[PDB]
Structure formats: C-alpha cells, structure tokens
DNA sequence: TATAATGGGA
C-alpha cells in the first residue's frame, strides 16, 4: 500500500522466549522505565 | 532404578497363607455387608460410610466437620448396631492387607506386556488397579484361590490400559486388537518369504473380510507419528521440523490478498444502494458467516422473497458492469 | 543443580534429598517424643520405612508352628523375651502372645 | 568386513532361536533370516562415508 | 504504549502459574483419530488454548 | 470403655477386639514423618529465613574456615530469597504449566503420516500418571501403591523439565533417542538463547556469482 | 467376571 514498513511492537522471538520460560515455571517479568509490568501480549494471552 | 525400589517394597510384605487368604477375604465380605446394614440403620449412602471408614483407618488428615460429624453419629449408636462399625473397620483393614500381599502377583503378570508403549511401572500400576477391583468383588465362598480371579483382572486392566494410553493419537479398542492381529501375521510370513509382504498377500493371509486396500489403510493408522525433533544428518544443528513448511499459516502474500479482496469488494459494493449492498452481504454470509435465504432477508427488510431476488439480481449486474470497467476483481479468481 | 538450592536451604545433602523426594526414607516433621535404638529422634531425621512402621504402627513378630503341635502359653497371655511359647519356639520380644489360627477346639 | 558384521548379527538370530521352538527338528530355513545381512550391506553402500 | 526496558526472572507460585493458564489439561488425548479435530480436554483443545 | 471405668495408661494405637471382648493398645506414637515433595514443601514452608540469617551470621564468625565457608554459601541462598521476595516453597510444584499448542505442534506431513513434538508425549506421560494417582487416592489404595505412583509422578514431572538429568531418559517405542525436554529447548546450540545470536535465514535476499 | 498362576532384565 505504499506505506513505510512499521516496526514490530514486540518481536516474536521475545514472545516465544517468555512462553518457553513460563513453561518451566519461571515468572518472566517485562518491565519498563519505572519497573512496572509491560504486557507484551496485547489482549492475546492476558485473560 | 525405581523398579528395584518397588520390588524391594512389595518384598517386605510376606505372602499370605491359604488360611489368611480365606480370613482376609472373609472380613472383607463381612465388612462390606456391615456397611450395607449401616445404610439401613443410619440411612445414608454406602460410599459415604465407605470413605469415612477408609479415612479413620489409613490416615489421620470437610476434615473437621463432615468427616468427624458422620463418624460421631456412627459412634453414638446402640451396642447391637456398633458391632457393624467395628466389623467394617477391620474389614477395610483386611482389604488393605489382601491387596498388599498380592502386589507380588501383579508384577509376575505385568512383565509379559512390556515393549507395547507403556513402561514396566505403568504396566504394574494399571495392573494394581485390577488387583483392587478383583478384591472388591471377590467371593471366597466359591472355594477358588484368589490368584485365579486376580489374574483375570490384572490382564483386563493392563490390556484396557494399553488400548487407551499407548497410542499418541487415541485408537478404539477393537482396532488395536485388529492392528495386533495384522502385526503378528506379517512376521511369520516374513520368515516364510524371507522378505516383507505386499498388501495383497497379507490380506490373503488375514482371512475373509480382508482385502489389499483394507490392510493398507489399517496399517496406515497403525504407525506412530514421527518426531519433529528427529535429527537430520550427522550435524547437530537441524531437526526434521526445521525443513517442514507451515501448510496452515498464511504467507505474507496470502494474508495481503485476503485483505485486498475484502477492501476491493467493499469499494465495489459502495457503488450500490445500501439496501442492494446489505442484501448481497446477507445472502453471501459477509455479515455473520451464514448465507441467509430469501426468507430471512425479506424478513429483515419487510419485503417478499421475490422482491429480495430482484434486488439481489439488479445489484449483481451493477457489480458486473463496474467490474467490466475497473477489472479490480477480475483476478483474486484462482 | 550442581549445588542444590533446596538441599542448601534445608541443610540436606544431595543423597538425603534424593531419598526423601523419591520415597526411600521418611523425614520427621514432628517426633511426638519418639525413641529408637537407645536414642530419641529429633526433627529432620531420616528413617527407613521399617523404622517408620515400627515407630508408628508397632512391632509384631509372628511365629508359625509345626502342624499338630500345641503351644505352652494361653491366648492373650503376656510373654517375656526368651520365654517358651512353644517347645523350641523361643520368644524374641516382650509382648502378648495372640493365637492366630486354631485347629483344635 | 561389514559382511561378517551382518553375519555376527545373524549369529544372534540363530543362537536365540534355539532356546525356543522344538529344539529337536528345526530347519535352518526358519533358523536363518535375510533381514540381518540385507540391512548390513545396505547400511554400507548407502550410509558409509 | 510503554517501552520495556528491563526483564526480571523469578520463581512462579502455583496461583501465578494458574494465572497464566486458560484451563486445565485433564486428559492425555490429543486429536480424534477420525475427525482429526482436537479432543475436548486434551493438549490441543480449543476451549482453552484458542481457536484453530 | 465402660463410660470412664477403664482408661489407657500409655500412648499407642487402638483396635477393638470383638471375639476376646478386649481392647488392646500397641505402643505406637502419632509421629509425623513424610516422604516425597510433600515433605520438602512443608519444610520449605516452615523455614524462618530471617532466623536462619542470624543463625548463619553467628556461624561465620567462628574461627574454622570450613564451617564458615559452608555458612557462607548457605547464606548466599538465604539472602537471595530474602532480597528477592521469592517464597522458598515455590521451588515445589503443585500446578505444572503447559506450553501453547502451536509451539509443540502436531501436523500431518506428506504421505499422510503425522509428525509431533516430543514435549507432547512427555506431557501425555505426566497426565496419565497424575490421573492414575487421583483415582487411586479415591479408591483408598494401600501406601505401597500410592508411593509408587508418587515416585513415577516425580519421575514424570522432571522428565518434562529435564529428561535424562536423573535416571534413564524416557524414549519412544522403537528408538533410543531421548525425548526433547523443556531444558533442551532453551539450552544447547539449538536452544532459544542461541537462536537469535547465531543468525537466521532472511527474506528479501539473493545470491549470485560476482 | 473364577483350575492356578505371587520380586525385572539388560
């Protein structure tokens, strides 16, 4: 559509790493500038 | 080695004499009958007394409420009816020792079923389930040794287990038996021919009701799946699944094509009146996913089946006209 | 893990932790004043299931008798270690002799 | 060399077939299989570097 | 909206593990041998993991 | 019995005898001794980490090098849970997570035959054993049986985690290849921590002689 | 649903 290609908000290699770590019962927290939780799964796996 | 651990544990429990075997089986049947006469005296269910007796025997720890209040009611009974409480308790103790003393028999039977998809300990534990069901409805009055009834139940529970758990993709029981019948015949004719059979000759060996196409399709389901982690080549940097394409996920070109199609159809439908377009979207399932017949669409718009058909036909040849001039939708057509 | 984190927190060797987690030995949460082999049993003590059943379900020893032979003791009669509950069948423990299966009445 | 390897694996295919069956009369036809030697030479010509 | 700047790793409690879960896999079944659809309480069930 | 006329004078288990019309009490304590991860979880749940810190700090001011080195390592673990907020019993699992299906897929390839991921059979062996333990507890099975299923359960869980680490690795029928565990998915050369570093095949690329 | 069958195997 003649648009500049956008950047991925959260790459897929990031998502797979977290779920494969959660599979081993390890809480992987993705924190931002002030240490608050960022949900790298936008309404997809958040319940 | 967990097998040596379990064999040593069942080793501590000595075997039981024919006198003990009759006595334990007696107390079991007496306890079971003592429970039924408590369901008449007190009035509550069999399984309730069954578990309250099992609790107070095999372990200390609703636990403070329901369990203890049922036992308390049982404790507050006349002497002539509290006999059956004591008889049920020791009867449940007899069931425990009857099981423990014959765990040695479960191993002696389960070891023959190895190499069928379930480990040894899985072959022992489903067999132990047969030993429990064997005890629960064993009647010693027939004067048969406990080993005869158990052996039938150990084999029933192991065969049933292999039919339900060994396959990754679950297969019916008769098909498993069928697949075993097929698998036994191909090995003796391999020895007779010196080579593996074709589907016609193994079908001729299977008997009536078996042809070359049925043996091929039943053997087709018989094979277990391949592992995606099957290594390819001596190099330790590639699995099988590393070379398998994703047949179900759409490609970037496919994903765009469906979006361009939905966009170009919207632009095409915008050349119609909103009723003309809404009729077509209802008839083709673009709204909720199901093709609405002329009746439902006429009910929506409050007109007849024929009036909807004319709207639908007029809307189509308007689309065909615009399509003959723009040619936007001529492709997407496979 | 090469240095066990659970074994470190509770002060258990890898051999001790192996026997507990994989059902080789019990461990004492509450001794309830138990004693064995001339010593008490402290908390966090490892003991075999033989020592567990003796300390929790009691110690009993059964002696089979040669057929037709009678016993020198009576039913529910207290015994002494070394006593002769049957000729040649010496008592190995203090307790109460209980007849289990009588053939003559 | 890989031939006698498939024979040493056919040797087991003979040794163990003797404890079973009718040890009095067994033909070497049902005592010997083509599967051991066939799979030995095929591994050589198809897999050996 | 906010940008991830740190990643922490820690232990997962049972209630936290259950917080990640969309359901309990109650059965060892996978797909039906005939329909090839996922089984209702198995490892591929759409009722928990999502639609196909 | 007798509404108070007779009382036991020693600790022990009871059993009411109806043939002799007697009540005997065997010298047996009500001791609490447990096996398995249930026992370890309780010990981890009862640890006062603050007291163990003071208890170990006063041990590393002892002159002996060996025991103040043992207390030194033992304090590193204690300080970790304290400063992090991790409750030590969390190292024992009650709920086991399950990876999403498309990361452990099951699909049919050419020829109609199916191809699946090893993790599925590991989960499948865990679900089978866990379900058998459930309907053995409900049936009121003796302890030798329960202990066996609990051993096989622990051996099923840590095979999902790290197949091969302890014991013989679980394999499929008809092969000696160990099934790939969750740890093999992260660790190693094909692991997820090496995947991004080692590079990838890329779209919008070509090749030719120059 | 019942003859009896009771500690693995590389």
């Amino acid at each position: 559509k003649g648009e500049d290609v956008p950047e991925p908000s959260v790459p897929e290699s990031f998502r797979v790493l977290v779920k494969e770590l959660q599979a081993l019962a390890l809480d992987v927290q993705t924190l931002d500038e002030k240490d608050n939780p960022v949900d790298i799964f936008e309404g997809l796996a958040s319940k | 080695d967990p097998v040596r651990q379990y064999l040593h544990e069942i080793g501590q429990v000595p075997l039981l004499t024919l006198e003990e075997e009759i006595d334990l089986a007696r107390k079991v049947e007496e306890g079971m009958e003592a429970i039924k006469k408590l369901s008449e005296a007190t009035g509550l269910d069999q399984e309730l007394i069954r578990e309250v007796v099992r609790a107070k025997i095999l372990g200390t720890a609703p636990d403070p409420k329901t369990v203890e209040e049922v036992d308390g009611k049982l404790k507050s009974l006349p002497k002539e009816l509290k006999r059956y409480l004591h008889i049920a308790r020791e009867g449940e103790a007899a069931r425990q020792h009857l099981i423990e003393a014959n765990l040695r028999l479960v191993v002696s039977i389960a070891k023959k079923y190895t190499g069928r998809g379930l480990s040894f300990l899985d072959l022992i534990q489903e067999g132990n389930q047969g030993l429990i069901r064997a005890v629960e409805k064993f009647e010693y009055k027939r004067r048969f040794k406990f080993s005869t009834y158990a052996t039938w139940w150990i084999r029933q529970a192991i065969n049933r287990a292999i039919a339900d758990q060994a396959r990754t993709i679950r297969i019916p029981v008769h098909m498993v038996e069928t697949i075993n019948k097929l698998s036994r015949t191909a090995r003796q004719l391999q020895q007779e021919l010196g080579r593996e059979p074709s589907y016609e000759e193994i079908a001729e060996a299977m008997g009536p009701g078996w042809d070359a196409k049925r043996v091929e399709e039943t053997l087709k389901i018989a094979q277990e799946p391949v592992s995606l982690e099957t290594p390819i080549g001596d190099e330790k940097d590639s699995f099988y699944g590393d070379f398998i394409p994703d047949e179900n996920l759409p490609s970037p070109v496919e994903a765009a094509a469906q979006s361009l199609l939905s966009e170009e159809l919207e632009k095409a439908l915008s050349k119609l009146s909103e009723r003309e377009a809404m009729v077509l979207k209802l008839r083709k399932g673009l709204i909720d996913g199901r093709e609405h017949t002329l009746e439902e669409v006429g009910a929506y718009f409050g007109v007849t089946r024929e009036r909807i058909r004319q709207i639908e036909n007029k809307a189509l040849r308007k689309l065909k006209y615009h399509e003959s001039r723009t040619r936007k939708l001529r492709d997407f057509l496979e | 893990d090469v240095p066990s984190k659970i074994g470190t927190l509770l002060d258990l060797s890898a051999t001790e932790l192996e026997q507990v987690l994989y059902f080789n030995k019990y461990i004492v949460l509450d001794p309830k004043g138990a004693v064995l082999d001339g010593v008490p049993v402290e908390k966090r003590q490892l003991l075999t299931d033989e020592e567990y059943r003796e300390l929790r379900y009691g110690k009993q020893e059964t002696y089979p008798l040669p057929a037709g032979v009678d016993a020198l003791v009576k039913d529910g009669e207290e015994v002494v270690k070394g006593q002769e509950l049957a000729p040649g069948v010496v008592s190995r423990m203090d307790g109460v002799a209980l007849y289990r299966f009588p053939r003559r009445v | 060399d890989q031939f006698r390897v498939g024979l040493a694996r056919l040797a087991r295919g003979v040794r163990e077939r003797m404890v079973m069956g009718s040890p009095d009369t067994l033909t070497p036809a049902k005592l010997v299989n083509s599967r051991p030697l066939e799979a030995a030479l095929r591994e050589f010509f198809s897999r050996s570097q | 909206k906010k940008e991830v700047r740190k990643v922490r790793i820690a232990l997962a409690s049972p209630e936290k593990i259950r917080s990640w879960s969309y359901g309990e896999v109650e059965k060892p079944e996978t797909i039906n041998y005939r329909t090839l659809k996922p089984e209702r309480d198995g490892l591929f069930d759409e009722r928990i993991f999502g639609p196909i | 019995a007798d509404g108070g006329k007779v009382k036991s004078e020693i600790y022990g288990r009871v059993e009411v005898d109806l043939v002799r019309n007697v009540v005997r009490v065997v010298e047996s304590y009500d001791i609490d001794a447990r096996m398995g991860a249930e026992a370890i979880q309780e010990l981890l749940k009862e640890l006062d980490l603050e007291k163990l810190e003071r208890e170990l700090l006063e041990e590393m001011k002892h002159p002996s090098r060996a025991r103040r080195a043992k207390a030194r390592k033992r304090l590193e673990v204690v300080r970790a849970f304290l400063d992090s907020g991790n409750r030590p019993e969390w190292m024992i699992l009650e709920a086991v997570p399950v990876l999403p299906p498309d990361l452990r897929p099951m699909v049919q390839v050419d020829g109609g035959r199916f191809a699946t991921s090893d993790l599925n059979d590991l989960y499948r062996r865990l679900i089978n054993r866990n379900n058998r333990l459930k309907k053995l507890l409900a049936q009121g099975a003796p302890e030798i049986i329960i202990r066996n299923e609990k051993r096989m359960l622990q051996e099923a869980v840590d095979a999902v985690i790290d197949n091969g680490r302890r014991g013989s690795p679980v394999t499929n029928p008809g092969s000696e290849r160990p099934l790939r565990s969750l740890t093999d998915i992260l660790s190693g050369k094909q692991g997820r921590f090496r995947q991004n570093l080692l590079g990838k095949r890329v779209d919008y690329s070509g090749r030719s002689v120059i």
Side-chain angles (χ1 to χ4, degrees):
Chain A
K1 301 172 183 172
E3 294 165 345
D4 196 324
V5 334
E7 81 173 12
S9 184
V10 40
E12 184 67 298
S13 51
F14 203 156
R15 295 175 178 172
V16 180
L17 217 203
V18 179
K19 289 302 164 181
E20 290 174 348
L21 278 169
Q22 287 180 341
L24 281 164
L26 303 174
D27 185 22
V28 174
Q29 313 168 359
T30 57
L31 290 359
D32 58 331
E33 172 185 347
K34 300 156 171 295
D35 303 40
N36 307 333
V38 175
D39 209 9
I40 61 175
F41 303 92
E42 64 289 6
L44 305 177
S46 301
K47 283 169 60 179
Chain B
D1 197 349
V3 185
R4 189 170 64 90
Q5 172 76 272
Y6 174 81
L7 292 174
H8 173 267
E9 287 177 343
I10 74 167
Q12 303 300 106
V13 175
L15 282 178
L16 73 174
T17 72
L18 171 59
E19 304 165 343
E20 301 172 14
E21 177 169 315
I22 296 300
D23 182 72
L24 290 180
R26 180 183 61 83
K27 298 178 176 178
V28 166
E29 189 170 346
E30 289 186 356
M32 284 182 51
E33 293 180 354
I35 296 173
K36 184 179 176 59
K37 303 213 186 64
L38 282 171
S39 180
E40 308 169 1
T42 49
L44 20 69
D45 297 340
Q46 301 278 87
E47 180 75 0
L48 271 63
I49 308 146
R50 190 58 169 168
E51 292 184 356
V52 180
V53 173
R54 285 179 176 174
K56 306 290 290 185
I57 290 299
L58 64 85
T60 43
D63 172 52
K65 209 205 191 85
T66 293
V67 176
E68 208 276 341
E69 73 189 357
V70 168
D71 187 50
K73 167 174 54 194
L74 294 176
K75 290 190 296 290
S76 64
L77 244 65
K79 173 189 178 303
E80 189 254 339
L81 294 183
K82 277 200 299 185
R83 275 192 45 185
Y84 299 67
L85 203 172
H86 303 288
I87 295 173
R89 290 287 191 92
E90 184 159 326
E92 189 58 281
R95 170 172 167 270
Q96 301 296 322
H97 306 92
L98 218 174
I99 296 174
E100 295 175 344
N102 301 282
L103 300 175
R104 182 176 286 96
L105 175 68
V106 181
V107 180
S108 59
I109 305 174
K111 63 181 179 183
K112 295 181 179 179
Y113 289 87
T114 54
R116 293 198 198 177
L118 262 60
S119 64
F120 201 171
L121 264 40
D122 295 321
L123 254 47
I124 294 177
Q125 284 304 111
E126 298 284 344
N128 287 334
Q129 288 198 56
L131 182 62
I132 303 176
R133 276 179 290 178
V135 168
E136 286 192 346
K137 66 173 185 70
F138 174 77
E139 39 192 359
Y140 70 147
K141 303 204 185 306
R142 296 194 186 190
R143 298 198 217 269
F144 296 74
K145 197 76 181 302
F146 175 75
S147 303
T148 307
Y149 205 12
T151 295
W152 184 92
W153 268 102
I154 311 303
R155 285 168 171 163
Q156 142 70 24
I158 291 176
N159 282 323
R160 175 69 179 177
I162 299 175
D164 292 344
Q165 303 177 1
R167 324 286 301 185
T168 298
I169 301 184
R170 186 124 135 82
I171 292 301
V173 178
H174 293 304
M175 291 199 58
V176 174
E177 312 174 23
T178 289
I179 287 172
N180 288 134
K181 296 177 183 177
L182 285 158
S183 192
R184 183 200 175 269
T185 312
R187 75 181 177 88
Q188 83 235 8
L189 95 91
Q190 152 68 232
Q191 190 68 64
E192 290 170 6
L193 283 186
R195 56 184 181 88
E196 287 192 346
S198 64
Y199 290 142
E200 181 189 16
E201 46 194 344
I202 180 59
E204 173 73 2
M206 280 297 299
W210 281 93
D211 43 45
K213 187 180 178 181
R214 184 187 172 188
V215 57
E216 174 175 6
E217 301 300 327
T218 48
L219 197 153
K220 183 62 179 180
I221 325 167
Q223 57 184 3
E224 259 89 357
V226 186
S227 173
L228 289 173
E229 301 85 5
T230 300
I232 284 186
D234 48 322
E235 56 276 3
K236 298 290 190 59
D237 52 25
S238 64
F239 305 97
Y240 181 14
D242 296 334
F243 300 86
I244 296 178
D246 196 335
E247 309 283 0
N248 310 281
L249 196 70
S251 75
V253 183
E254 296 180 15
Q258 78 171 1
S259 300
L260 297 174
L261 180 65
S262 178
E263 290 171 5
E264 210 80 37
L265 284 172
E266 280 299 328
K267 295 189 292 185
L269 293 175
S270 62
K271 294 299 182 180
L272 311 174
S273 78
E274 83 162 333
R275 179 199 267 187
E276 284 171 339
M278 188 50 182
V279 164
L280 258 50
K281 284 185 281 188
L282 289 163
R283 295 300 318 281
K284 301 300 177 177
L286 290 156
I287 305 302
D288 54 16
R290 56 181 65 190
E291 313 183 32
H292 295 307
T293 53
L294 291 178
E295 298 80 332
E296 298 156 35
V297 182
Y300 193 141
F301 291 97
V303 289
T304 57
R305 302 179 65 259
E306 287 309 309
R307 183 51 187 165
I308 294 291
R309 181 191 300 172
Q310 315 317 314
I311 293 166
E312 180 183 2
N313 292 336
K314 186 181 58 177
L316 284 195
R317 51 178 183 261
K318 292 175 70 176
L319 256 31
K320 296 181 186 179
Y321 169 72
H322 294 309
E323 172 56 25
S324 66
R325 288 166 69 259
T326 70
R327 300 200 127 197
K328 305 290 190 61
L329 302 162
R330 194 171 188 271
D331 301 322
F332 306 88
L333 197 34
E334 318 117 9
Chain C
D1 194 39
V2 251
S4 183
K5 304 298 173 179
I6 285 175
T8 301
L9 263 187
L10 308 166
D11 195 44
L12 230 49
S13 68
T15 306
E16 291 177 332
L17 193 58
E18 182 88 22
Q19 297 171 334
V20 183
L21 289 166
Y22 293 84
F23 297 82
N24 190 44
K25 298 191 181 305
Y26 298 81
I27 49 105
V28 171
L29 277 63
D30 189 5
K32 295 292 186 60
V35 61
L36 155 134
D37 297 337
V39 305
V41 46
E42 320 293 338
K43 285 185 175 179
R44 312 159 36 86
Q45 183 166 336
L46 284 71
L47 42 90
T48 328
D49 58 41
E50 49 170 3
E51 309 175 358
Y52 174 76
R53 273 191 283 100
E54 180 182 8
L55 265 58
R56 185 169 169 85
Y57 290 90
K59 186 54 171 295
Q60 48 172 310
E61 191 174 2
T62 308
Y63 305 87
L65 295 183
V69 181
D70 196 343
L72 189 57
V73 73
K74 292 307 290 184
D75 204 355
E77 180 171 0
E78 196 168 355
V79 209
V80 181
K81 179 186 177 182
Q83 194 176 341
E84 204 167 346
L85 54 90
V89 181
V90 56
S91 176
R92 187 163 143 153
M93 52 169 297
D94 280 311
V96 173
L98 292 180
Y99 295 57
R100 277 184 57 76
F101 281 100
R103 317 253 181 74
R104 200 192 81 212
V105 178
Chain D
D1 228 78
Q2 292 299 111
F3 195 109
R4 71 182 61 180
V5 172
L7 256 43
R9 296 176 178 177
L10 181 65
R12 293 180 59 93
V14 153
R15 294 270 193 82
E16 66 185 347
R17 292 300 199 196
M18 301 169 48
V19 304
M20 44 167 288
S22 63
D24 267 331
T25 299
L26 295 180
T27 61
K30 60 178 177 176
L31 191 64
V32 179
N33 195 343
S34 302
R35 183 173 290 174
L37 182 62
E38 184 95 5
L41 296 180
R42 195 182 189 277
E43 284 290 324
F44 176 65
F45 292 84
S46 300
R47 316 279 170 78
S48 172
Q49 299 308 99
Chain E
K1 177 177 292 296
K2 295 294 294 186
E3 169 191 349
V4 38
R5 301 298 303 261
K6 314 174 187 181
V7 172
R8 194 193 192 208
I9 181 175
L11 297 192
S13 69
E15 53 270 20
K16 172 154 284 302
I17 291 175
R18 302 189 188 102
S19 69
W20 302 337
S21 180
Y22 278 69
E24 180 187 2
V25 182
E26 299 181 355
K27 292 174 182 176
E29 284 76 354
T30 65
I31 60 180
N32 186 281
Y33 67 103
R34 183 48 176 171
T35 65
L36 306 187
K37 212 188 53 57
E39 285 295 330
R40 186 180 169 83
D41 286 314
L43 289 76
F44 294 88
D45 171 39
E46 309 178 34
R47 304 171 61 251
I48 51 190
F49 298 109
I52 297 186
Chain F
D2 293 348
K5 187 175 295 182
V6 64
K7 300 152 296 300
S8 67
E9 48 190 349
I10 194 61
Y11 281 103
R13 188 187 73 261
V14 92
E15 37 182 343
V16 173
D17 192 15
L18 292 182
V19 50
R20 297 175 184 83
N21 287 283
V22 86
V23 164
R24 63 181 83 93
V25 167
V26 300
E27 185 167 352
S28 301
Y29 320 101
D30 187 17
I31 186 179
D32 185 18
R34 313 181 188 180
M35 288 176 159
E38 176 191 3
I40 297 307
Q41 179 188 19
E42 183 71 19
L43 292 184
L44 289 170
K45 187 55 179 294
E46 294 176 347
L47 267 185
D48 188 271
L49 294 175
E50 296 184 9
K51 179 183 180 304
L52 194 49
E53 179 181 359
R54 295 182 279 103
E55 197 171 344
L56 287 165
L57 287 172
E58 302 295 327
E59 269 211 17
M60 55 188 56
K61 55 174 60 179
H62 183 90
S64 179
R65 175 75 180 101
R67 80 174 67 183
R68 72 178 158 94
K70 304 167 189 174
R72 189 163 289 101
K73 305 302 297 179
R74 205 163 175 266
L75 186 61
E76 271 182 339
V77 186
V78 172
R79 291 285 182 89
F81 294 84
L82 284 168
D83 296 343
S84 74
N86 283 330
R87 304 186 64 87
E89 59 274 19
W90 292 349
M91 311 156 87
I92 308 303
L93 296 174
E94 297 174 4
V96 171
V98 175
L99 198 67
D102 289 357
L103 306 185
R104 30 160 258 268
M106 176 180 300
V107 70
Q108 40 186 359
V109 296
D110 192 76
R113 193 185 173 115
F114 276 91
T116 181
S117 309
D118 292 340
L119 237 194
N120 285 320
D121 278 341
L122 293 189
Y123 285 147
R124 205 169 61 85
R125 275 197 18 161
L126 173 56
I127 301 171
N128 274 329
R129 294 185 170 177
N130 186 44
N131 286 342
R132 187 188 304 113
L133 220 197
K134 289 176 182 176
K135 61 183 194 285
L136 280 181
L137 298 173
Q139 282 178 341
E143 188 62 26
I144 288 85
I145 301 180
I146 293 298
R147 287 157 58 188
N148 199 29
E149 263 300 310
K150 288 182 170 178
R151 262 197 305 269
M152 301 156 57
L153 192 66
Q154 181 70 71
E155 279 199 1
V157 171
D158 52 28
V160 166
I161 304 297
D162 197 310
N163 185 24
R165 181 68 184 87
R166 138 79 191 268
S168 183
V170 42
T171 66
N172 272 330
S175 70
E176 308 284 2
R177 185 191 57 92
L179 268 50
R180 209 193 184 191
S181 64
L182 289 164
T183 302
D184 300 330
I185 283 180
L186 296 184
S187 299
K189 301 84 216 165
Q190 296 147 314
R192 182 58 60 170
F193 287 94
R194 293 260 175 77
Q195 190 157 343
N196 265 19
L197 291 183
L198 261 50
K200 303 163 178 182
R201 305 270 186 182
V202 292
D203 282 334
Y204 302 95
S205 65
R207 191 188 194 196
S208 174
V209 62
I210 56 173

